[PDB]
């Protein structure tokens, strides 16, 4: 229904906004694009579901997110992939792991601040109906 589609259009505008804010942060630059298959050929062999902020934008535009909870699922994925791939004691890994958690924490904190629970609740119920 038109009313349902309009609810999801509002969600999409919001999710693009949140993602664009994450993407312009210097800390998060490494998470903005897919891992280059040549530079890191072994990335595919250790990570089963690659995710990054430009992909997240693609999925938004493909109407793949119907809730904020589905969006955050992918943000968590970005964080958890970085933790899996870069687990070493050395400072260069620590930095990446810290940036990955900072990205996650930031996304949640934006949502906690700016999202209406009743708007999200509506989105969820339209989704369950489908």
Partner 1 sequence: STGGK
- Residue from 17, 54, 58, 121 in contact with a second copy (CB under 8 A): 121
- Residue from 24, 44, 46, 95 in contact with a second copy (CB under 8 A): 95
Taking the alpha carbons at both ends of the chain, their separation in whole angstroms is: 12
Q: Given the complex with a second copy, which of 48 and 130 has the nearer CB atom?
A: 130
Structure tokens at 29: 């630059």
Q: Residue 122 CB, nearest distance to Cl ion (Å)?
A: 9
**DSSP-assigned letter for residue 36:** P
- Regarding 127 and contact with a second copy (CB under 8 A), the answer is no
DSSP state letters, 44-68: HHH-SS---HHHHHHHHHTT--SSH
- Residue from 3, 45, 49, 129 in contact with Cl ion (CB under 5 A): 3
51 CB-side CA count, 13 A: 21
- Residues near a second copy, by CB under 8 A: 3, 7, 27, 90-92, 94-95, 98-99, 102, 116, 118-119, 121-122, 125-126, 129
């Amino acid at each position: 229904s038109m009313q349902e589609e309009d609810t999801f259009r509002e969600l999409r505008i919001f999710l693009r906004n949140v993602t664009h804010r994450l993407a312009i942060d210097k800390r998060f630059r490494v998470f903005t694009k897919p891992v280059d298959p040549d530079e890191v050929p072994d990335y595919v062999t250790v990570i089963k579901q690659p995710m990054d902020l430009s992909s997240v934008i693609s999925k938004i535009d493909l109407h793949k997110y119907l809730t904020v909870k589905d969006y955050l699922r992918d943000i968590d994925l970005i964080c958890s992939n970085a933790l899996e791939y870069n687990p070493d004691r050395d400072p260069g890994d620590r930095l990446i792991r810290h940036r990955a958690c900072a990205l996650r924490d930031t996304a949640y904190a934006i949502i906690k601040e700016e999202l209406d629970e009743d708007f999200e609740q509506l989105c969820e119920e339209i989704q369950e109906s489908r």
